[PDB]
């Protein structure tokens, strides 16, 4: 049984000079050079011991500098010897054949026309499928060279060709950096990037399928000095779907050496070379850090990335991290992660990152800092699985095994110390003693140590009184809980200014979602409104503020355009997790009586179960009908999260809260509608957004909303 083995290689010739005419295959000079090179390669192959198995040789391309011929050859050999004809063996045989004839007085027929350098011969394995892929792409083809410090712009592809290949060659000592930018909104082309001269599957750097909205820029590095780019399946005919730039980049060492200071703050970052570009296939990073004392351990906070264990033989695709001889492999997930490394004997810590296989993922950035070994989270609870400080005893389970909400004294309730009796938080520091001998209203004015439901003023100080924000009286020394309290004041069918923060998000003249104004230029909403196909484009949408009647215009309303649109990075469509989105307005809102922002709750804001809140959303009054012509308010009662966790069984996360409607009927709630709740000071606080629910018509099911206090950090980061 004869088997065909494919070897693709490059051979350098010093007696020939590259010319521009060789770049075009249709040129007569290129054809003559290809014929001569094929004849020389066939003679060289037949001269060696492999000539008995030689099948067919063909020169594929020519390169810059010394005349570099990239060709492919086939050997029909017995199967039993297939393991013996490794590419290294073939390369060694070719080198020996080239070297033997140099000293000999006899002149080879091919040596009379071409002088080949033995050191320049490179051979790699290939497959019949690789041969077919190369042999169908013999149409659209260009060759180019990239000089130092010069950025090259592509030459436009031909729409007639169904598969185009760019062959990129640069300096030997420089790496090639390739930039992809997405011009069209969405498109259906396929692209592949390979580290070698041809489309060899084993050498694939990265393959881009699809054409996405989330990220417009794709930056790819190549370990070598050569690169191949293959574009295929332009299905719906248009032009310029994408833009490539390319440039040479210097190689530098990412290994470092530092000593940590005395602090508990994140002191810096560690990143792969050329962040956020795709790391090189052969990268190697070594980081050495010295802690100031044995009492501090090292915390590494990741972003959409995590480490996990592996079985030694298995090579992990994502990457290999070694931490003090412990081996770990990455796993890109849409949740935060923190690796905590204790120190026992040596203050020095060593972190290594290595790429184990050819396939490369996006760059990795990790924030490093110190943490006191004992009680690592001060006033918080450390979830063991993912090493994050989660709130303790606030009624919300924040750890997969739920150890933060277990066997504590007063769950979501204040604890008198005189006789250990739980009393309600609204009774603390209100103005009348409710603990038997006055503990509840002690130390209300001074600074305290932070815990659960303790508002933290701007100078990292704490406040005893629960919900002290925007209540018309200073509560901490800083006075930061009364600044910017201009929101939340109002001016069944709603009236002409009952809910000034309500906004309508419309495209093509119809109302798809509702939203709540949170700043002068930002509107919060739900992410699942942009899930549809054509609706993700920013240009389409239009926002209306200060309107109650959908049918006819009224003096109050104003219309803006959406400038930017940011979804939450960890948003999951299948589980509705992290269902929140932000829209930037064209220009800031003028604070009239018709339009006023809603007050954003703090991270420690307490929303009490059993409290009544209002869902102010347009909705279809009857099943299957149009949206109602009048904005309709309806009240719901908050439910403890244990109850709806038992209702939904592994489907409700710390980022969601639950509300129940009037028993015996309604379900119409809109999408992205607010769930504002009134405070004791007469101000409305936005407590959630309409996310999902089951059962319009089921007897006792609840609606599930995006818990804003669980995503308040990202909101404040984006807005500020």
């Amino acid at each position, epitope marked *: 049984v004869m088997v065909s083995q494919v070897y693709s290689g490059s051979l350098r010739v010093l007696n020939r000079h590259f010319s521009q005419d060789l770049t075009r295959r249709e040129s007569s000079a290129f054809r003559s050079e290809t014929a001569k090179a094929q004849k020389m390669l066939k003679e060289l192959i037949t001269s060696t011991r492999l000539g008995t198995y030689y099948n067919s040789s063909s020169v594929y391309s020519f390169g810059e500098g010394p005349l570099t011929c990239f060709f492919w050859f086939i050997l029909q050999i017995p199967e039993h010897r297939r393991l013996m004809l490794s590419p290294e063996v073939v390369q060694a045989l070719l080198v020996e054949e080239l070297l033997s004839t140099v000293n000999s007085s006899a002149a080879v027929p091919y040596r009379a026309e071409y002088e080949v350098d033995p050191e320049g011969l490179v051979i790699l394995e290939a497959s019949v499928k690789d041969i077919a892929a190369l042999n169908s792409t013999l149409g659209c083809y260009r060759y180019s060279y990239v000089g130092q410090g010069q950025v090259l712009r592509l030459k436009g592809p031909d729409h007639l060709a169904s598969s185009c290949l760019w062959h990129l060659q640069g300096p030997k000592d420089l790496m090639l950096k390739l930039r992809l930018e997405w011009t069209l909104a969405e498109c259906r082309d396929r692209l592949a990037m390979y580290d070698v001269a041809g489309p060899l599957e084993k050498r694939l750097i990265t393959s881009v399928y699809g054409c996405s909205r989330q990220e417009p820029v794709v930056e790819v590095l190549a370990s070598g000095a050569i690169m191949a780019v293959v574009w295929k399946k332009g299905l719906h005919s248009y032009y310029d779907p994408f833009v490539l730039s390319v440039q040479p980049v210097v190689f530098q060492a990412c290994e470092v050496n530092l000593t940590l200071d005395n602090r508990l703050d994140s002191q810096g970052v560690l990143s792969t070379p050329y962040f956020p570009s795709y790391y090189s296939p052969q990268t190697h990073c070594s980081w050495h850090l010295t802690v100031p004392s044995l009492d501090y351990g090292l915390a590494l906070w990741f972003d959409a990335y995590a480490l996990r264990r592996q079985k030694y033989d298995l090579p992990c695709t994502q990457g290999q991290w070694t931490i003090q001889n412990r081996r770990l492999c990455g796993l890109r997930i849409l949740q935060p992660y923190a690796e905590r490394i204790p120190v026992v004997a040596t203050a020095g810590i060593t972190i290594n990152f290595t790429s184990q296989i050819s396939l490369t993922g996006p760059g990795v950035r990790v924030h490093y800092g110190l943490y006191n070994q004992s009680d690592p989270c001060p006033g918080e609870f450390l979830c063991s699985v993912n090493g994050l400080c989660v709130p303790a005893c606030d009624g919300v389970k924040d750890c997969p095994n739920g150890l933060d909400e277990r066997n504590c004294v007063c769950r979501a309730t204040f604890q008198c110390k005189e006789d250990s009796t739980c009393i309600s938080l609204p009774k603390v520091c209100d103005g009348q003693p409710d603990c038997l001998n006055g503990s509840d209203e002690e130390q209300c004015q001074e600074g305290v140590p932070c815990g659960t439901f303790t508002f933290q003023c701007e100078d990292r100080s704490c406040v005893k009184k629960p919900n002290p924000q925007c209540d018309g009286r200073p509560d901490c020394r800083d006075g930061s809980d009364e600044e910017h309290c201009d929101c939340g004041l109002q001016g069944a069918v709603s009236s002409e200014g009952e809910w000034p923060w309500q906004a309508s998000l419309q495209v093509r003249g119809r109302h798809i979602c509702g939203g709540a104004l949170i700043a002068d230029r930002w509107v919060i909403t739900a992410a699942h409104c942009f899930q549809e196909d054509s609706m993700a484009s920013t240009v389409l949408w239009t926002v209306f503020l200060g309107k109650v009647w959908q049918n006819s215009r009224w003096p109050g309303e104003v219309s803006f355009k959406v400038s930017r649109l940011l979804l939450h990075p960890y948003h999951e469509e299948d589980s509705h997790d992290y269902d929140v989105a932000l829209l930037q307005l064209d220009h800031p809102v003028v604070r009239s009586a018709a339009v006023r922002p809603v007050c954003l709750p703090a991270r420690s804001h307490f929303f009490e179960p*059993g409290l009544h809140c209002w869902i102010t959303g347009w909705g279809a009054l009857r099943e299957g009908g149009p949206i109602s012509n009048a904005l309709q308010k309806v009240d719901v009662q908050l439910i403890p999260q244990d109850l709806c966790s038992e209702v939904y069984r592994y489907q409700v996360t710390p980022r969601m809260l639950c509300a129940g409607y009037r028993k015996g009927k309604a379900c119409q709630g809109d999408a992205g509608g607010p769930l504002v709740c009134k405070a004791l000071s007469g101000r409305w606080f936005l407590a959630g957004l309409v996310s999902w629910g089951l059962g319009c018509g089921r007897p006792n099911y609840f609606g599930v909303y995006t818990r804003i206090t669980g995503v308040i950090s990202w909101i404040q980061q984006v807005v500020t």
Partner: antibody, heavy 124, light 108 residues
């Protein structure tokens, strides 16, 4: 400090009529549903009748359906229970209890504030 | 309609002991359960509602747990002012129905 004081219990012939009164103090009477809970001497608690936040609707049990009648006067902040066609099984201690919500359409309807109780005994 | 029941019908423990009382309705109601603490001769006192929430003023020795059909009231440590009668009621749907009752004596 909320209080509920009751009055109107006494000896009644087996078939007569009686009226109990419950006066509230310390809270807003017109925003909470109330109920009457009876406990026969030496026995467990038993629900009797209930009334919504403002006269909107009254609820009864099965063993006292058609005989008892609950009512509310928000002007003087009082809750009345009128009983008639009494039997020998209606002798018990009656408590005036307050609920956590305005009515029973929502999910929080526990009894938090109670009255001392009045002993209504019926014999021939 | 629903027929509440509790176990055990009686108990006897000492100061410092941990006491467990069980409440099982005949059909699940959504766990809108409430616990009452009647003293021998006084009005009942509400301790726990929604089967886990605790009422203000109640000492932090009572814990409520359970779901579905089975619910539990836990007294971590006994105290002299803690021997009383405990009743469980279900507060969702209209024949409001209390439990039979559990008596806690003093062990000797």
């Amino acid at each position: 400090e909320v209080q509920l004081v009751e009055s109107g219990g006494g000896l009644v012939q087996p078939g007569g009529s009686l009226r109990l009164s419950c006066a509230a103090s310390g809270f807003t009477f017109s925003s909470y549903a109330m109920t009457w809970v009876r406990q026969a001497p030496g026995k467990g608690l038993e629900w009797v009748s209930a009334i919504s936040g403002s006269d909107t609707s009254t609820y009864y049990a099965d063993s006292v359906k058609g005989r008892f009648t609950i009512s509310r006067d928000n002007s003087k902040n009082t809750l009345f229970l009128q009983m008639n066609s009494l039997r020998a099984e209606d002798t018990a201690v009656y408590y005036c209890a307050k609920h956590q919500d305005y009515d029973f359409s929502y999910y929080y309807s526990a009894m938090d504030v109670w009255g001392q109780g009045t002993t209504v005994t019926v014999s021939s | 309609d629903i027929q509440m029941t509790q176990s055990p019908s009686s108990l006897s423990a000492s100061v410092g002991d941990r006491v467990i009382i069980t409440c099982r309705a005949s059909q699940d109601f959504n766990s809108w359960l409430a616990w009452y603490q009647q003293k021998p001769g006084k009005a009942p006192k509400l301790l726990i509602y929604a089967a886990s929430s605790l009422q203000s003023g109640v000492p932090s020795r009572f814990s409520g747990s359970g779901s579905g059909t089975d619910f539990t009231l836990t007294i971590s440590s006994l105290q002299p002012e803690d021997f009383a009668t405990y009743y469980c009621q279900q507060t969702d749907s209209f024949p409001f129905t209390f439990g039979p009752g559990t008596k806690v004596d003093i062990k000797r």
